[PDB]
Ligand binder design. Structure first.
Ligand code: CLA
Ligand code: CLA
Ligand code: CLA
Ligand code: CLA
Ligand code: CLA
Ligand code: CLA
Ligand code: CLA
Ligand code: CLA
Ligand code: CLA
Ligand SMILES: CC1=C(C/C=C(\C)CCC[C@H](C)CCC[C@H](C)CCCC(C)C)C(=O)c2ccccc2C1=O
Ligand code: SF4
Ligand code: SF4
Lengths: 80, 67, 107, 143, 165, 41, 35, 734
């Protein structure tokens, strides 16, 4: 499926997870940010690449990136 | 700890981050975190980016004086 | 329709120059222009024009004439609206000019 | 959460007529998703696959063909009535997989029990150029 | 007599075009009584056409094989054949006016930035300030080249917003 | 008055004023100098 | 050397009907070829 | 899942959708993105593909020769090259009706035939082919050559025959061999064939393989060549009253400098072209042994690249590091090759019509128009391909650490300045050209056309007066005998060239007026705008402010979503796909100008073009409406003339244009939802749900949609203009 990569510039604001319509991201404990939270993608096989997480990222550039490629039944959003 | 880990709050800074929207731009320091995070320098900018935000966190090595 | 309706007619529109119907021919040309100009908004997208605007921003920043209000490309919905509006206006005015010139000259 | 709940097919479905955007042949060929919640009272909600239904006072079970529909129903129930539902995925052979509350605390929380995966520890824009990774099968963002 | 072309006064197609225009104006005029407003309107149109055809002649304008006047754009060639007033003087005048516009816009951009919310001044114009800068732009090239001399016309590449490579 | 003046100070109103001013200037120039093409004093 | 007169009556239906039909048959079997 | 059709992509194999087919075709020959691909395997696949394309080209020209020989009138056209029209191929359509069969019988044929417009008849008459048996043996020999090339590609693909990586990367030896052998001795053999065959065949002497090694091309017999008296070859040139098919007014000359045209056939002299190709061969051979091979002499590419750096930091590091950049990145070489070849075919198009090299080619108006239009469209297409593959080079294989401070790093550093200046010049040209055209149209509409602005193109007229055209007057070179340019070559090529350039009948330096000036500025606007789009796509290919990480997303990706205001059409592929539209408009402009000017020249009403190209009503009415009367009357309820097929393919092109509008305007969400509804309809129906699809039907990708819309748009454009051009030039001429 698609590739979801999260960098260290994330501030743990949990906006990307709330904007996710397929429950791909998660919040794990961290020490590199003030909020002590870091975004993770343990369910990247269910991500369709809608880039809704990138819209909700408040940091400049993007702390979360979605790269398309190798579309599957789950990645193409097919009910059939 | 001694002095402060970053620049003086409220002072103008120039962002040296190349991938940032505010590269070679002047912003105002809001607060500098002292716990030891990667990007403690909170900078507020007068002009918003395409996402509409105006604040970002930068590290110590990507801020200089306004020339 | 191509020959006996569109080519058999519309000869009054193109021969209207030098007469009182020449404004219909000018409006016909302007309508063709607006219809063609709509296609750049109907096609393409936003990132291309955004980067072009970034280059123009660099050009105005070199001369220190960059506006305080940041210029941005039209939104995708806004670009679609501009494209459909100019497309409809061009087609409507084309048919209007052709119909009026043909029906006034020979009618 | 502490113990992963097991789905019950005998739980009553919410009061609804016939759906047209319901489960297709993929439900009997590939996996299909099933959402469960616990309604304290009867009320009318809007399904993402059609019109409106009425949930029963008790357990409620619904079936969908896409996980996005299940999460849309979940967030609608959480925003409108604070229901906290949970959906499973059932394959063709009957394998049941727990999907939304992986630690039972929802992904908005942390719970100090999830290991962060697929996290690049370098800043964005510090990735190598595609010329550096050529004829290797490794993307610049995958390192 | 440059580019194998004849002057408009010496040309025959120019006079033929003028005669045809006068003929069709007279044909339109003959359908109205002399004591009617369309008659005076068509007489004024004919007088304007005759004045324009007289002014296009005896002014250096030349036409080739169709009676439609042609314009020479190369300086020097236009200078030695009295064709500078065709495009050479108008292009200098347009450059003067365009520099006026650019200098006025630059002055308004610079002078409305050292204040709180410059976008508010951009969207709601300071009309007395705009008129003052409008009446102060008569010496735009002097101020432009002086700003070039002191270096305030151009910004250095360190304070300029730049796209990543 | 000053609120109405700031409304008149908005960009579309001053653009409209410039539009009428420039259009009227060019129209009066064309009317009192009928159809010129070449600068001949 | 010179082809016979019935060559347009044979090669044109062959490359207009038969050859595209067998090409589409081979392509359809190749698209849906599974392990 | 995991079907075997995309064997070059394991990820595409595990795609249960119809898109797997489509992405299995568009990514077919992109070997750099294939799984488990090495550089040596990529080079071997490239070599096999090149041999395949060569075999296809040779098979195609063999088929052209065979279909001209069989079901053609080559001998009848040889006898009378003025009246009877060439025949391309016979028509066997069972859907044809009897009036359609009767109407298509032209050129003295026994069946329905197509009038040839490719111009191979004139070319094969010029090179010396006269009989149908010669065309037959040439076609079968080219078919054998194509089969040999296909077998060679297969054998070089086979193991223990694949070339090494250093064999492909040996740039110096390849450059020397292709400069000296592919261009030098090839041109030497071609001009030897010219001297041996074409000049005797143009002088009524048959030279064949049977009588080869027996007939001497020059009566002196090669002894002036060894004696150094090369001027003896240019002793008795062909006279003005010389027949091309016969020996009347012939001569004994194989190499000369008789600049101009043959008066009988309005084409360049065969001896002049033979001398030209001999000089070209000598220049290529003497420059084909300059680079450093395994011998001790030669030139190293990297040494000259690194040494050519301006002092005092004019270009920074200079041209250093470009050798590895060219050698490692194949897309850079692809872009350079496509740009050079596009400039070459642009020059070919601009030099065929003014200087016809083939006998009886200028009289064939439809042939010249079709050849010019085809060459210009191919030129624009590979111009755009050069720029697109340059953007591909910038995205895929470009290491700034390698070429740091060089010319590439510098032009990537100030790319904003280049893009801004090109945008400014595009805005300037477009604003002033549209303002001038609208001003002229309004002035002509008001009944007083003398008020329009007609800026005389004095620069081109001054150039043409400096090159021999005395129509504009003036006293520059090649018009006054006191000039050194007139004195030099006064008895070499000037008397013929001046006669050719002072004639208004041919297309050699035609009269240029204010309408020509305006359309030339329109052409300049089109070229500068397409250049602006393509260099903005190439320079911002690997990154921009909206997408700094554009290199990680590849060359052809749809968008980044609606975030940051909207990011659709941000890849360099989208910039190329917009530049395809702009290139199509520009080539449409140049072909409209060429077609209207040449049609008014052939009709003799050059004044109509002079007074009608100023305003766009003249372009719409006197060109797009007046000349389309015979096209639209190809088929009607009254009957049918010979231009029925051209009217049908004209409407066909307008239809494909509309389908391009379909695939370009509407985007993916509506069609995806409609496909979902159709999937439900097929799933929930009796007597039809027994069947099923092996792959799930999905809507086409956004990049795929752009490509399909571009293809339909370009196909409709090409077919429409080809139909209009051929029907207008052939319906009233011959
Ligand atoms: C007699 C004095 C003299 C002069 C006139 C020059 C001049 C030149 N030398 Mg040089 N040279 C000199 C002495 C001189 N040199 C000496 C003493 C040495 C030591 C032996 C050299 C060694 C040397 C080397 C080794 C090389 C040069 C090169 C060059 C050229 C490029 C210089 C440069 O940096 O680009 C000029 C500076 C720039 C910053 C370039 C800007 C270019 C702009 C951006 C392009 C604008 C294009 C624009 C769109 C055009 C619009 C027109 C429209 C119609 C399209 C230039 C023509 C180079 C060369 O051959 O190039 C031809 C080269 O490789 N020189
Ligand atoms: C025939 C139709 C048409 C026209 C006129 C234009 C015009 C333009 N496009 Mg193009 N374009 C079109 C179709 C068209 N497009 C299509 C179908 C595509 C494929 C999708 C593109 C793809 C494309 C790209 C990729 C690019 C352009 C660019 C441009 C600009 C070129 C600069 C120029 O020539 O000076 C301007 C000339 C013009 C004719 C513009 C029209 C201005 C006139 C004078 C009217 C101005 C207003 C007037 C005073 C009336 C005011 C009142 C009114 C508003 C109510 C210009 C805005 C380039 C650009 O943005 O420039 C940097 C660019 O990068 N276009
Ligand atoms: C680059 C654009 C350009 C071009 C193509 C021309 C072309 C021409 N100019 Mg011009 N010129 C130009 C710009 C240009 N000019 C500019 C910017 C100036 C300074 C204002 C001049 C000043 C000039 C003079 C003073 C003369 C020419 C003359 C000429 C002609 C011959 C030039 C020559 O070397 O012999 C030719 C028509 C000469 C002429 O008219 O022919 C004798 C002449 O006397 N030109
Ligand atoms: C007065 C302000 C101002 C100034 C000084 C400039 C200056 C420049 N622009 Mg910019 N531009 C402006 C406004 C301005 N622009 C506006 C409002 C727009 C949006 C329509 C643009 C759109 C634009 C584009 C798309 C491009 C430029 C380019 C350029 C450069 C070429 C010069 C030129 O005439 O380009 C031509 C400029 C125009 C046709 C824009 C004219 C817009 C209107 C007609 C003028 C507005 C005047 C303003 C109301 C005055 C305010 C005074 C105040 C007291 C009220 C130059 C750096 C080009 C470049 O990059 O060159 C390197 C280029 O490609 N500009
Ligand atoms: C961009 C190209 C272009 C150029 C160079 C011109 C130039 C000209 N046209 Mg044209 N015109 C254009 C575009 C253009 N126009 C367009 C797009 C239209 C359609 C809307 C027209 C419609 C048009 C008409 C209907 C008429 C002109 C006229 C004129 C003249 C200017 C008269 C004027 O404004 O008073 C002069 C004003 C000044 C000099 C301003 C002075 C201000 C201070 C003092 C400086 C001049 C020959 C008129 C003319 O005389 O015909 C020859 C005329 O009757 N034009
Ligand atoms: C390029 C290849 C090709 C060839 C050789 C043919 C050949 C033929 N087609 Mg055509 N056709 C083609 C492609 C082709 N088609 C395509 C691509 C389309 C779709 C656009 C059509 C659509 C089409 C229609 C709609 C019709 C034909 C018909 C016909 C027949 C003409 C009438 C006739 O002789 O009676 C047929 C005589 C025979 C001896 C054939 C019977 C023997 C068969 C093969 C068993 C003929 C056999 C007509 C037809 O067959 O009428 C029923 C007819 O109405 N064709
Ligand atoms: C010397 C010539 C040459 C060579 C060797 C290449 C080679 C390549 N190019 Mg390039 N290219 C060229 C010319 C060339 N191109 C030209 C002239 C253009 C401009 C049109 C382009 C534009 C271009 C783009 C924009 C892209 C490439 C890409 C590619 C790669 C994919 C090829 C492949 O295996 O897929 C095989 C591909 C296909 C089979 C698709 C072809 C479909 C065509 C358009 C259909 C034909 C149109 C029409 C329907 C025909 C019927 C007409 C109708 C009337 C009957 C490959 C490296 C791609 C790449 O590198 O991937 C990132 C890429 O993105 N090229
Ligand atoms: C003098 C010797 C010689 C000659 C005549 C050729 C001739 C040719 N080689 Mg070359 N080649 C040579 C030596 C030579 N090679 C050597 C020594 C090497 C190794 C360093 C190569 C490596 C090489 C590669 C890697 C390729 C060629 C290709 C080609 C063909 C280019 C297409 C063409 O004809 O353009 C026609 C040009 C005009 C009509 C003008 C052509 C048949 C290409 C090929 O396979 O065919 C396309 C190709 O990809 N050659
Ligand atoms: C219902 C309306 C309609 C529509 C939408 C179309 C659509 C089309 N026609 Mg058709 N047409 C129609 C009715 C229509 N037709 C009718 C009724 C007739 C009469 C029989 C024609 C006669 C006709 C001809 C003769 C031709 C077309 C062509 C075309 C294509 C447009 C090519 C294009 O986009 O280039 C964009 C447009 C241009 C490049 C030039 C536009 C024409 C201008 C006026 C010429 C002057 C340009 C010149 C350089 C100066 C301008 C410079 C600028 C800076 C101002 C497209 C398939 C052409 C074609 O197939 O492709 C070339 C073609 O040759 N049509
Ligand atoms: C061209 C283009 C742009 C760029 C267009 C922009 C930025 C809008 C420009 C509007 C101008 C500023 C309107 C005013 C123009 C003149 C300056 C006003 C008239 C001047 C005369 C009176 C002198 C998009 O943003 C876009 C977005 C989505 C889909 C397609 C497109 C698209 O095609
Ligand atoms: S939206 Fe961005 S900053 Fe916020 S938690 Fe997600 S990756 Fe981090
Ligand atoms: S290409 Fe489509 S999905 Fe992408 S930004 Fe544009 S409209 Fe949105």
């Amino acid at each position: 499926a698609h590739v979801v990569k999260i960098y260290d510039t994330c501030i743990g604001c949990t906006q990307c997870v709330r904007a996710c319509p397929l429950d791909v991201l998660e919040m794990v404990p961290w020490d590199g940010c003030k909020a002590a939270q870091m975004a993770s993608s343990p369910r990247t096989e269910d991500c369709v690449g809608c880039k809704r997480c990138e819209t909700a990222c408040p940091t400049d550039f993007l702390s979360v990136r979605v790269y398309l490629g190798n579309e599957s039944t789950r990645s193409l959003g097919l009910a059939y | 700890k001694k002095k402060e880990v970053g620049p003086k709050r409220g002072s103008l800074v120039k962002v040296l981050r190349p991938e940032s929207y505010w590269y070679n731009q002047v912003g105002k320091v809001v607060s500098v975190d002292q716990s030891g995070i990667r990007y403690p320098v909170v900078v507020r900018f007068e002009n918003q980016n395409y996402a509409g935000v105006s604040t970002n966190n930068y590290a110590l090595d990507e801020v200089t004086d306004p020339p | 329709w191509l020959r006996d309706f569109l080519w058999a007619q519309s000869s009054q529109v193109i021969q209207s120059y030098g007469s009182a119907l020449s404004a219909y021919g000018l409006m016909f040309l302007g309508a063709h222009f607006v219809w063609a100009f709509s296609l750049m908004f109907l096609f393409s997208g936003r990132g291309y024009w955004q980067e072009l605007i970034e280059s123009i921003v660099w050009a105005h920043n070199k001369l220190r004439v960059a506006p305080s209000i940041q210029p941005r490309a039209l939104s995708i919905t806004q670009g679609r609206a501009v494209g459909v509006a100019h497309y409809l206006l061009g087609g409507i005015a084309t048919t209007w000019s052709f119909f009026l010139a043909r029906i006034i000259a020979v009618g | 959460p502490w113990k992963q709940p097991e789905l019950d097919p005998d739980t009553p479905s919410p009061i609804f007529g016939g759906s047209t955007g319901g489960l297709l042949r993929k439900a009997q060929v590939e996996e299909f998703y099933v959402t469960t919640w616990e309604s304290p009272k009867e009320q009318i909600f809007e399904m993402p696959t059609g019109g409106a239904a009425i949930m029963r006072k008790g357990p409620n079970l619904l079936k969908f063909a896409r996980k996005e529909q299940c999460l849309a129903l979940t967030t609608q129930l959480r925003t409108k009535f604070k229901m906290t539902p949970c959906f499973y995925r059932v394959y063709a052979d009957g394998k049941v997989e727990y999907l939304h509350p992986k630690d039972g605390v929802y992904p908005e929380k942390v719970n100090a029990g999830r290991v962060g995966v697929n996290q690049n520890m370098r800043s964005i824009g510090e990735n190598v150029d595609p010329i550096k990774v050529k004829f290797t099968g490794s993307q610049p963002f995958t390192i | 007599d440059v580019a194998g072309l004849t002057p408009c006064s010496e040309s025959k197609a120019y006079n033929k075009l003028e005669r045809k225009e006068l003929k069709t104006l007279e044909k339109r005029l003959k359908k109205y009584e002399p004591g009617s407003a369309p008659y005076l309107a068509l007489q004024a149109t004919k007088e304007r056409t005759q004045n324009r055809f007289k002014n296009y002649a005896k002014a250096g304008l030349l036409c080739g094989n169709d009676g439609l006047p042609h314009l020479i754009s190369d300086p020097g060639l236009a200078l030695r054949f009295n064709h500078a007033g065709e495009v050479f003087i108008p292009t200098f005048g347009f450059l003067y006016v365009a520099g006026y516009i650019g200098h006025v816009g630059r002055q308004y951009i610079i002078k409305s930035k050292e204040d709180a919310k410059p976008t508010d001044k951009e969207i709601i114009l300071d009309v007395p300030l705009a008129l003052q800068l409008a009446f102060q732009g008569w010496a735009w090239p002097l101020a432009a080249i002086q700003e070039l001399r002191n270096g305030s016309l151009l910004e250095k590449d360190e304070n300029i917003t730049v796209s990543p490579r | 008055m000053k609120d109405f003046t700031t409304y008149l100070s908005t960009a579309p109103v001053v653009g409209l004023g410039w539009a009428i001013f420039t259009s009227g200037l060019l129209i009066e120039i064309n009317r009192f100098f009928p159809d010129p093409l070449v600068f001949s004093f | 050397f010179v082809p016979p007169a019935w060559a347009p009556s044979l090669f044109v239906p062959l490359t207009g009907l038969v050859l595209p039909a067998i090409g589409m048959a081979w392509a359809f079997t190749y698209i849906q070829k599974e392990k | 899942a995991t079907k075997l059709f995309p064997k070059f992509s394991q990820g595409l194999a595990q795609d249960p959708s119809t898109r797997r087919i489509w992405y299995g075709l568009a990514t077919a020959h992109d070997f750099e993105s294939h799984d488990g691909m090495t550089e040596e395997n990529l080079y071997q696949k490239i070599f096999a593909s090149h041999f395949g394309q060569l075999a296809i080209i040779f098979l195609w020209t063999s088929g052209n020769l065979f279909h001209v020989a069989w079901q053609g009138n080559f001998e009848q056209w040889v006898t009378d090259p003025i009246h009877v029209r060439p025949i391309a191929h016979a028509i066997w359509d069972p859907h044809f009706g009897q009036p359609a069969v009767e109407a298509f019988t032209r050129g003295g044929a026994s069946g329905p035939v197509n009038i040839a417009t490719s111009g191979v008849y004139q070319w094969w008459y010029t090179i010396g082919l006269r009989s149908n048996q010669e065309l037959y043996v040439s076609s079968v020999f080219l078919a054998l050559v194509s089969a040999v090339f296909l077998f060679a590609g297969w054998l070089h693909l086979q193991p223990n025959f694949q070339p090494s990586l250093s064999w492909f990367k040996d740039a110096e030896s390849r450059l020397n061999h292709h400069l000296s052998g592919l261009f030098g001795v090839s041109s030497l053999a071609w001009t030897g064939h010219l001297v041996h065959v074409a000049i005797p065949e143009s002088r009524g002497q048959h030279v064949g393989w049977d009588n080869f090694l027996s007939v001497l091309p020059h009566p002196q017999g090669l002894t002036p060549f060894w004696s150094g008296n090369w001027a003896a070859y240019a002793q008795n040139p062909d006279t003005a009253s010389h027949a091309f098919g016969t020996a009347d007014g012939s001569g004994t000359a194989i190499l000369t400098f008789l600049g101009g045209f043959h008066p009988q056939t309005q084409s360049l002299w065969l001896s002049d072209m033979a001398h030209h190709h001999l000089a070209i061969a000598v220049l290529f051979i003497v420059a084909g042994h300059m680079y450093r091979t395994n011998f001790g002499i030669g030139h190293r590419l990297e040494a000259i690249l690194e040494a050519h750096t301006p002092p005092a930091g004019g270009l920074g590091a200079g041209h250093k590091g470009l050798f590895h950049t060219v050698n490692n990145s194949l897309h850079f070489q692809l872009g350079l090759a496509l740009a050079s070849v596009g400039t070459i075919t642009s020059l070919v198009a601009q030099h065929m019509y003014s200087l016809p090299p083939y006998a009886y080619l200028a009289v064939d108006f439809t042939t010249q128009a079709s050849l010019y239009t085809h060459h210009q469209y191919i030129a624009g297409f590979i111009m755009c391909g050069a720029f697109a593959h340059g953007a591909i080079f910038f995205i895929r294989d470009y290491d700034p650490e390698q070429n740091k401070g060089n010319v590439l790093a510098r032009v990537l550093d100030h790319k904003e300045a280049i893009i801004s200046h090109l945008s400014w010049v595009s805005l300037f040209l477009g604003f002033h050209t549209l303002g001038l055209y609208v001003h002229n149209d309004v002035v002509q509409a008001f009944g007083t056309p003398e008020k329009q602005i007609l800026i005389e193109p004095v620069f081109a007229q001054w150039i043409q007066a400096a090159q021999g055209k005395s129509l504009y007057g003036f006293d520059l070179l090649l018009a006054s005998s006191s000039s050194s340019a007139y004195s030099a070559g006064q008895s070499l090529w000037l008397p013929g060239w001046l006669e050719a350039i002072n004639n208004n009948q041919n297309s050699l330096f035609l009269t240029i007026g204010p309408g020509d000036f305006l359309v030339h500025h329109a052409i300049a606007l089109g070229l500068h705008t397409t250049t602006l789009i393509l260099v903005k796509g190439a320079l911002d290919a690997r990154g921009s402010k909206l997408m700094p990480d554009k290199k990680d997303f590849g060359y052809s990706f749809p968008c980044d979503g609606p975030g940051r205001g909207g990011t659709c059409d941000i890849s360099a592929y989208d910039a190329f796909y917009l530049a395809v539209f702009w290139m199509l408009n520009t080539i449409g402009w140049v072909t409209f100008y060429w077609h209207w000017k040449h049609l008014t020249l052939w009709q003799g009403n050059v004044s109509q073009f002079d007074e009608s190209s100023t305003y766009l009503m003249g372009w719409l009415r006197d060109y797009l409406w007046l000349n389309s009367s015979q096209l639209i009357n190809g088929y009607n309820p009254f009957g049918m003339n010979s231009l029925s097929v051209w009217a049908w393919t004209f409407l066909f092109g307008h239809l494909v244009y509309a389908t391009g509008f379909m695939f370009l305007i509407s985007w993916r969400g509506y069609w995806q939802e409609l496909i979902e509804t159709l999937v439900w309809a097929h799933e929930k129906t009796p007597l039809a749900n027994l069947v099923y699809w092996k792959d799930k039907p999905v809507a086409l990708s956004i990049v795929q949609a752009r490509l399909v819309g571009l293809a339909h748009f370009s196909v409709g454009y090409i077919f429409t203009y080809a139909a209009f051009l051929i029907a207008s030039t052939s319906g009233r001429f011959g």
